[PDB]
Amino acid sequence: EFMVSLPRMVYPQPKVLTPCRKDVLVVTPWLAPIVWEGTFNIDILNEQFRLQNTTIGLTVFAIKKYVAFLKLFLETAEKHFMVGHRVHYYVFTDQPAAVPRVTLGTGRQLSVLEVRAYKRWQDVSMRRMEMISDFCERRFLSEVDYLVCVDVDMEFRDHVGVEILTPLFGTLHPGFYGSSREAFTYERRPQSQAYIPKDEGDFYYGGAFFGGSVQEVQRLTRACHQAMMVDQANGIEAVWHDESHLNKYLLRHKPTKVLSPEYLWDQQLLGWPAVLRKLRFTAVP
Amino acid sequence: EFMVSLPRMVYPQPKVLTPCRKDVLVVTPWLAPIVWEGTFNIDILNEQFRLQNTTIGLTVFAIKKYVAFLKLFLETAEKHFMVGHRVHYYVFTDQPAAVPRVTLGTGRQLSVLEVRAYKRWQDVSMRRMEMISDFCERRFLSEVDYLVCVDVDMEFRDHVGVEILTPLFGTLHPGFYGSSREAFTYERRPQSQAYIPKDEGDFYYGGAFFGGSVQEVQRLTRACHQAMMVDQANGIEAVWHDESHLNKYLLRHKPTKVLSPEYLWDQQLLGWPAVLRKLRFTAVP
Ligand SMILES: CC(=O)N[C@H]1[C@@H](OP(=O)(O)OP(=O)(O)OC[C@H]2O[C@@H](n3ccc(=O)[nH]c3=O)[C@H](O)[C@@H]2O)O[C@H](CO)[C@H](O)[C@@H]1O
Numbered sequence A, B: 001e002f003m004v005s006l007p008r009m010v011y012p013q014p015k016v017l018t019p020c021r022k023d024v025l026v027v028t029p030w031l032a033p034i035v036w037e038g039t040f041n042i043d044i045l046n047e048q049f050r051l052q053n054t055t056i057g058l059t060v061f062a063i064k065k066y067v068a069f070l071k072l073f074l075e076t077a078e079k080h081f082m083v084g085h086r087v088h089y090y091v092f093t094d095q096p097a098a099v100p101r102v103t104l105g106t107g108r109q110l111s112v113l114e115v116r117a118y119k120r121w122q123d124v125s126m127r128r129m130e131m132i133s134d135f136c137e138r139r140f141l142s143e144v145d146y147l148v149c150v151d152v153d154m155e156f157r158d159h160v161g162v163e164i165l166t167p168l169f170g171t172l173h174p175g176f177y178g179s180s181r182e183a184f185t186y187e188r189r190p191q192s193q194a195y196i197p198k199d200e201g202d203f204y205y206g207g208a209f210f211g212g213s214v215q216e217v218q219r220l221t222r223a224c225h226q227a228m229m230v231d232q233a234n235g236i237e238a239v240w241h242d243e244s245h246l247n248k249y250l251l252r253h254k255p256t257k258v259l260s261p262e263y264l265w266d267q268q269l270l271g272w273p274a275v276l277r278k279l280r281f282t283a284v285p
């Protein structure tokens, strides 16, 4: 929509002849920014998004025993996720009375959406695509500008803000950002909808953190669900489930921003490398 | 609009831990790509834009003696500008019978739009904003997806393609890309609409090459024209005319891509520095 003028702001001048990072790739070959610390001035971005009255939805599934993760998830989201902006949390659970009472900042609200629990963890994980797509029909189009879709067994430890927002984003999986594409754990069986040949692939995106505009998230989640249903009719389940399908989708429909592994990390397994200036969203050990 | 799937493509894998340029800034602090050679894979971008059936309009003014520049301008545009894509050239002139007969490739067309000639070069240059804005009302919304607005006393010497396309872009002026903001020749008189204080400014954009979606170009050109009219009522003319106003606009409404000086160069005045891997669009000596 129509965008008013930014106010006067004083900040350091961008330096054309100085790279903003000398150690990492900060733009994809299709000219999508790769979001690392040092690539953005959050003061400028916060102005741009506040002037558009941006509302961010954050979807999270807490099914069966994973309700235990919600307290820390939501408490740390309150400290670090889109602070200053309008936020709507959507907690999908089979136990709607077991969502913890977390105190929310002003302009932030939470809705609990009851869903069925599948028996296998694989199905719980995979059926998020259907459940998100179903909810894009009603709630999300009327309530938010962007959707952010994450795993619950996680905590925010540092800023996750409007720098991530764009029509469609994925996040670099922390186990593969330095790997060659042949080592990526894409689905490699041609019988699956998620099949990616050994000579294709840009990145290995993590299934635990993706998002975009409601329109683009509806598209992604619908496509992944329909692909899963084809596989199921054919008696095949992708090797890494929803993540496999997400990877196939983002190969053929390129994201408009890619998040660095700052945004999806596991310190227990991978430590704190020099290349990560901040660890923003991390696995609970 | 709805975007179909990219076909299978084989190309080099992006390297997350290798910067694409070690000598230049490739992304602005508001996460707009800065377009240099080596930042983009044109095969991927050409697919994306061809699948959207993209049409690019290219506006150029050839008023009074500047009709002499059209032949080379258009001949070199045919060799280098958006080849493979639908192009519509819009030549604005006071001499509609003096446009040279340049042979166009398939899918490329040219319209001649007659306009008045102002006496002073300053006014000819400045009134392009009004003339472009007026034509965005009718022709451009129905005929093109993007508009590219350039000076005529120029030639294409290398690829200028869909890598530039985005909602709103400006180009780094070749005289100031290495300068500190205090040295930028912004309008510095507070009495002018184009005023920029000494402590503000991201880049000095060249008035000779800007563009965007028709919507965004309509906004920019309208705003610059209305600002010029206020200045004229107050008896002041911005120091660098349309370029001054363009700079004020792009300070307060940040571009979604910035073009490096590859896209706006003068080899006579500035030679061929190591930082420029290609000289794409250049002054005629
Ligand atoms: C790469 C890797 O080694 N992945 C392991 C990890 O996958 P994942 O960590 O990818 O699986 P996950 O169990 O975290 O499922 C993804 C998300 O789905 C939701 N969810 C899933 C199950 C459930 O009962 N309730 C629920 O709410 C929740 O939001 C969770 O964070 O963990 C699995 C079981 O945990 C398996 O050990 C996988 O091999």
Ligand SMILES: CC(=O)N[C@H]1[C@@H](OP(=O)(O)OP(=O)(O)OC[C@H]2O[C@@H](n3ccc(=O)[nH]c3=O)[C@H](O)[C@@H]2O)O[C@H](CO)[C@H](O)[C@@H]1O
Residues within 6 Å of the ligand: B060, B061, B062, B063, B064, B065, B066, B067, B121, B124, B125, B150, B151, B152, B153
């Ligand atoms: C930074 C600098 O030193 N700028 C000089 C340069 O500005 P510019 O090169 O910015 O002015 P310009 O005369 O090229 O005008 C911009 C554009 O307007 C169009 N146009 C302008 C005039 C005209 O009679 N017909 C016409 O068609 C044409 O598309 C041209 O390329 O040239 C001017 C006269 O040329 C002055 O010498 C300026 O000081």
